[PDB]
């Protein structure tokens, strides 16, 4: 339980702040006060990444459990935690 959550807790103030901060900045007019695979994209490449529009939907579809493809202040710190071991 709480597999990625325990990881988002070991993050650094530079990561938690950049997340919520970049989120609100990218949530401006977002689909629903959040950043779904369609909004997180431009928000992910800015954190130091460059995935594709195809793996994006599948990425959340794996961590998400509602079938919405949205990532508010929660699935963002979780989906980014898996990318830490997906490239290592
Ligand atoms: Ca979701």
From Swiss-Prot:
One of its GO terms (molecular function) is calcium ion binding. Residues 15-50, 51-86 form the EF-hand domain. Keywords: Acetylation, Calcium, Metal-binding, Muscle protein, Repeat. The keyword Calcium applies. Ca(2+) 1 binds at residues 64, 66, 68, 70, 75. One of its GO terms (cellular component) is cardiac Troponin complex. Slow skeletal muscle Tn-C can bind 3 calcium ions per molecule. Domain I does not bind calcium. Belongs to the troponin C family. Troponin is the central regulatory protein of striated muscle contraction. Tn consists of three components: Tn-I which is the inhibitor of actomyosin ATPase, Tn-T which contains the binding site for tropomyosin and Tn-C. The binding of calcium to Tn-C abolishes the inhibitory action of Tn on actin filaments. This is Troponin C, slow skeletal and cardiac muscles. The lineage of its organism: Eukaryota, Metazoa, Chordata, Craniata, Vertebrata. The gene is TNNC1. The chain holds residues 3 to 89 of 161 of the full protein.
């Amino acid at each position: 339980a709480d597999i990625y959550k325990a990881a988002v807790e070991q993050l650094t103030e530079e990561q938690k702040n950049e997340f919520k901060a970049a989120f609100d900045i990218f949530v401006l007019g977002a689909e629903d006060g959040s950043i779904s695979t369609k909004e997180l994209g431009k928000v992910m490449r800015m954190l130091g990444q460059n995935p594709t529009p195809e793996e994006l939907q599948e990425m959340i579809d794996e961590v998400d459990e509602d079938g919405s493809g949205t990532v508010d202040f929660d699935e963002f710190l979780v989906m980014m935690v898996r990318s830490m071991k997906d490239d290592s």
